[PDB]
Structure formats: structure tokens, C-alpha cells
């Protein structure tokens, strides 16, 4: 029972519309929600697949993935997911899984930010548990080298460098905390110097936003060109050594980037090339070990398993 974009065309043909309206509304008060939602889907899929396991709250039986190093004080937008979930439950009771809801929400967030528009495959079901340890082991970190980034993607089933380069384009919008670049700014890999792959002019700007012994929670735009617009500007930045986190710049500057450099350039040269690759990579990531058929359930409240 493979995933299909028409899964809810009869049971809830208005699901995508409900999701979109919820995001449109939220964007007025929080213009960062779109980026935040896309990241939630990414963090869901990289841990036991896209099964909404990340949406589960703490229980006496299992710890929440929300306390993972990659999610704690970082992941956000959970209340917004509850809102669209409630709205969908009203329109179509016990029909749309949280896993599918989050996938649609990620796609709509990308489109609303100016990105490509497409119908994501559907039919995923919700996990019966959360996987904190697995999240700590599977979620990639900003300090990862290119070989480590590739290993992290391959680990969850994405072997193509195209998947890695295209999906990294998610950093074409959204925010990043000073904490994750302090090493690149003042002491990279215990060298006592800033990361040489970071543009010196941009280095000065970032140091001003993130001074030593400063607020590590302060936010910086992932894309200095178009902070809230989903476009290929992220790759243009890499070509100028303006990737924000180490994992971004590595795609273009790593000694192991022989295969990723041409992809970065290709995406920087054509928005069409990037958008096509992003959709293709997004659908592949959304196809990671999904629960289908009668496996798992259709969670009524994304924060807890049905009882
Ligand atoms: C290649 C490995 C990746 C690493 C190491 C990574 C790392 C990070 C880090 C450190 C942040 C900042 C979190 C914070 O400041 O609290 C972030 C933000 C973000 N990431 Fe990535 N990321 C990766 C891949 C992806 C992918 C595959 C997507 C989705 C297609 C994605 C989408 C986002 C978005 C949209 C934001 C902004 C979230 C917000 O503003 O709330 N990332 N990422
Ligand atoms: C049944 O509830 C809803 C339906 C829609 C439909 C939108 C459309 O058809 O474009 C939007 C929001 C709702 O809460
Ligand atoms: Ca998951
Ligand atoms: Ca952008
Ligand atoms: Na696959």
C-alpha cells in the first residue's frame, strides 16, 4: 500500500486548504512559522520515518523527541500543528494522520514562502511511540563535516548527494542561533581562529550579531539575501562562502565536495533546476519508512497516542 497524493481526495478533499489557511493566518503574527514547520517535518522523517513521532509529548513509558539535542530549545511550531489538526478533525473526523498533516504543512509552508507547489504522496500513519535516543543519533548537527552529513542522510535512506544538497536548501529561510556558529566565528576546530571557509566580510557582520560571551540564543537569518523567501539564493551564498553554518558551507568547500559542488552551482544558476530537485528530494524524504494500511493509527491529538 504505497503512498499516493490522492489518498484524501474522497475522505478529506479540503485537507490541504485547511492546512494552508492555518499557516497563512499564523504567518501574520509569526513570519518564521513556515520555516519552522518545514524543519519539523525534516526532524520527523529522520527519526523512524515520517510517522509524527516527533509530535508526541513525554510519557511514563517513553521520553519525547522534543528533548533531543537537535530539538530542545530549537524546534518550534507545535501549537500551530495542534490548531490545524483540530480544524482538520472538525472537517473530517479521525481521517487525516498527524504524519500526513505535517507533510502537507511542510509542503504548503514551502509554497507559501514562494517555493514550488506540488501534491505530496499521502497515506502515512502515526507512530505508537517516540524515539529520543534515535533522534539524538540520527539528526545531523551543524558541526558535521561533509562525510558526516552524507553518512547521516544515507543512514535514513537518502543516498543521493542531490538529496543532501537540495534539502539543505531549506536554509533559504528561517533562523539560526548564535550558539551554532560561535566556533566558526572565534575558535573553529580548536584552531583558535575563525573558520577559513567563512567570507571575512560576512564574518565581521556575524561577530557583531554574535559577540563572544554574548547571548547564544540570539537569532540570525540562515539566508542573508532573502531571509523569508524560499528561493535559490541560499546556493548563491555558498558560492561566496556565505553559508551560515558549517554544514552549509561544507557542501561547497569540503575536500569531499567534488560531487556536491556541481549541484550547488546548478541550483544557484537555475531556480527551476533547484525547485525540481527540492520537490524530488522532499518526496523521497517523505517516503522514509512510513507506517501504512492498518499499521499504527490515526492520532486524534498529535501529542498523545489514542486511548
Ligand atoms: C544537512 C543537515 C542539516 C543540519 C546540520 C541542519 C541544522 C540546522 C540548525 C543548527 C538550525 C538552527 C536551529 C536553531 O537555531 O534553533 C536549522 C534551522 C532550519 N533548518 Fe536545517 N539542518 C539540516 C538540514 C535541513 C533540512 C533537510 C531541512 C528541511 C528541508 C532543514 C530546514 C531548516 C529550517 C527551515 C530551519 C529554520 C527553522 C526555524 O526558523 O524555526 N534543515 N537547521
Ligand atoms: C470545513 O472547515 C474548513 C474548510 C475550509 C475550506 C477551504 C476551501 O475549500 O478552499 C477551510 C477552513 C476550514 O476550517
Ligand atoms: Ca519520526
Ligand atoms: Ca531565501
Ligand atoms: Na527511498
Which residues are 278's β-sheet partners?
none
Helices (H) then strands (E): counts for the chain? 13, 2
Name the residues around ion ligand 3, CB cutoff 5 A: 44, 47-48, 51, 53
Cβ partners under 8 Å of residue 120, min gap 6: 5, 103, 104, 106, 107, 282, 283, 286
The answer to whether 66 touches 79, Cβ cutoff 8 Å, is: no
Q: Is the shortest distance between the CB of 25 and ligand 2 below 6 Å?
A: no
Q: 167-194 as b/e, with b when 16 or more CB fall inside 10 Å?
A: bbbbbbbbbbbbebbbbbbbebeeeeeb
Q: H-helix or E-strand containing 175?
A: strand 175-177
Q: Which ligand is nearest to the CA of 20?
A: 2
Residue stretches of the annotated binding site: 44, 47, 49, 51, 53, 65, 140, 171-172, 223, 226, 231
From the list 99, 75, 74, 71, the residue with the least C-alpha distance to 85 is: 99
Cell readout for 207 is: 561577530
Q: Based on the number of CB atoms within 10 Å of its own CB, is 118 exposed (0-12), middle (13-18) or buried (19 or more)?
A: middle
Residue of 16, 91, 95 with the most ligand 2 atoms within 8 Å of its CB, for mutation: 91
User: Strand locations in 192-231, DSSP E?
Assistant: 219-221
The answer to whether 226 touches 232, Cβ cutoff 8 Å, is: no
**Phi, psi angle pair for 221, to nearest 5°:** -70, 130
Residue 4 exposure: Cα atoms within 13 Å on the Cβ side: 8
Cell readout for 138 is: 540520527
Name all contacts of 93-96 with Cβ < 8 Å and 24+ positions apart.
Answer: 94/298, 94/300, 95/8, 95/11, 95/12, 95/298, 96/8, 96/12, 96/15, 96/298
Tell me the C-alpha distance between 277 and 279, whole Å.
Answer: 6
Sign of the Cα pseudo-torsion (219, 223, 229, 231, in order): negative
Query: Domain 140-285 belongs to what topology?
Result: Peroxidase; domain 2 (1.10.420)
Helix axes of 271-285 and 98-112: crossing angle, nearest 10 degrees:
170
Q: Is the shortest distance between the CB of 92 and ligand 2 below 6 Å?
A: no
Check: CATH 1.10.520.10 for 3-139+286-306?
yes
Q: Supply the residue whose CA is at minimum distance from atom 8 of ligand 2.
A: 17
Tell me the C-alpha distance between 112 and 268, whole Å.
Answer: 21
Tell me the C-alpha distance between 298 and 98, whole Å.
Answer: 7
Catalytic site includes residue 43: yes
Q: Is the shortest distance between the CB of 21 and ligand 2 below 6 Å?
A: yes
Sign of the Cα pseudo-torsion (77, 138, 49, 164, in order): positive
In residues, how long is the chain?
Answer: 307
Helix, strand or coil, per DSSP, at residue 291: strand
The answer to whether 243 touches 195, Cβ cutoff 8 Å, is: no
Residue stretches of the annotated binding site for heme b: 171
Kindly state the DSSP code that residue 294 receives in the 8-state scheme.
T
The answer to whether 144 touches 246, Cβ cutoff 8 Å, is: yes
From the list 161, 111, 146, the residue with the least C-alpha distance to 275 is: 111
Cell readout for 9 is: 481526495
Tell me the C-alpha distance between 201 and 203, whole Å.
Answer: 5
CA 113-281-79 angle, to 5 degrees, is 45
The Å distance, Cα 99 to ligand 1 centre, comes to: 19
Q: Which of 20, 41, 43, 66 is catalytic?
A: 43
3-139+286-306 and 140-285: identical CATH topology: no
Name the residues around ion ligand 4, CB cutoff 5 A: 172, 223, 226, 229, 231, 233
Method by which the coordinates were obtained: X-ray
Q: Taking the domains of the chain in order of start, what are their residue ranges?
A: 3-139+286-306, 140-285
Cβ partners under 8 Å of residue 266, min gap 6: 273, 274
Q: Supply the residue whose CA is at minimum distance from atom 1 of ligand 1.
A: 168
Q: Is the shortest distance between the CB of 88 and ligand 2 below 6 Å?
A: no
The answer to whether 100 touches 122, Cβ cutoff 8 Å, is: yes
Helix, strand or coil, per DSSP, at residue 297: strand
Cell readout for 244 is: 551560515
Tell me the C-alpha distance between 41 and 49, whole Å.
Answer: 10
Which residues are 122's β-sheet partners?
4
The Å distance, Cα 233 to ligand 2 centre, comes to: 34
Q: How far is CA 74 from CA 11, 172, 177, 192, in A?
A: 35, 17, 9, 27
Resolution for this PDB entry, in angstroms: 1.7
From the list 294, 307, 237, the residue with the least C-alpha distance to 97 is: 294
Amino acid at each position: 500500500m504505497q503512498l499516493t497524493p490522492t489518498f484524501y481526495d474522497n475522505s478529506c478533499p479540503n485537507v490541504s486548504n485547511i492546512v494552508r489557511d492555518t499557516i497563512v493566518n499564523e504567518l501574520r503574527s509569526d513570519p518564521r512559522i513556515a520555516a519552522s514547520i518545514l524543519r519539523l517535518h525534516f526532524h520527523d522523517c529522520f527519526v523512524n520515518g515520517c510517522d509524527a513521532s516527533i509530535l508526541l509529548d513525554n510519557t511514563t513509558s517513553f521520553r519525547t523527541e522534543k528533548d533531543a539535542f537537535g530539538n530542545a530549545n530549537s524546534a518550534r511550531g507545535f501549537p500551530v500543528i495542534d490548531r490545524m489538526k483540530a480544524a482538520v478533525e472538525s472537517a473530517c473526523p479521525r481521517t487525516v494522520s498527524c504524519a500526513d498533516l505535517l507533510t502537507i504543512a511542510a509542503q504548503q509552508s514551502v509554497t507559501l514562502a514562494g517555493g514550488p507547489s506540488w501534491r505530496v504522496p499521502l497515506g502515512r500513519r502515526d507512530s505508537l511511540q517516540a524515539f529520543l535516543d534515535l533522534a539524538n543519533a540520527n539528526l545531523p548537527a551543524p558541526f558535521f563535516t561533509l562525510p558526516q552529513l552524507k553518512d547521516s542522510f544515507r543512514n535514513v535512506g537518502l543516498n543521493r548527494s542531490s538529496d543532501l544538497v537540495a534539502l539543505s536548501g531549506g536554509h533559504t529561510f528561517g533562523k539560526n542561533q548564535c550558539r551554532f556558529i560561535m566556533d566558526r566565528l572565534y575558535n573553529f576546530s580548536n584552531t583558535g581562529l575563525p573558520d577559513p571557509t567563512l567570507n571575512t566580510t560576512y564574518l565581521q557582520t556575524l561577530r557583531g550579531l554574535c559577540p563572544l560571551n554574548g547571548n547564544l540564543s540570539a537569532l540570525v537569518d540562515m539566508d542573508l539575501r532573502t531571509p523569508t523567501i524560499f528561493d535559490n539564493k541560499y546556493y548563491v551564498n555558498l558560492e561566496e562562502q556565505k553559508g551560515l553554518i558549517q554544514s552549509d558551507q561544507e557542501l561547497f568547500s569540503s575536500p569531499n565536495a567534488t560531487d556536491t559542488i556541481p549541484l550547488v552551482r546548478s541550483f544557484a544558476n537555475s531556480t527551476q533546476t533547484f525547485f525540481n530537485a527540492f520537490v524530488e528530494a522532499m518526496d523521497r524524504m517523505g517516503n522514509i519508512t512510513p507506517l501504512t494500511g492498518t499499521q499504527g493509527q490515526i492520532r486524534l491529538n498529535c501529542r498523545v497516542v489514542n486511548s
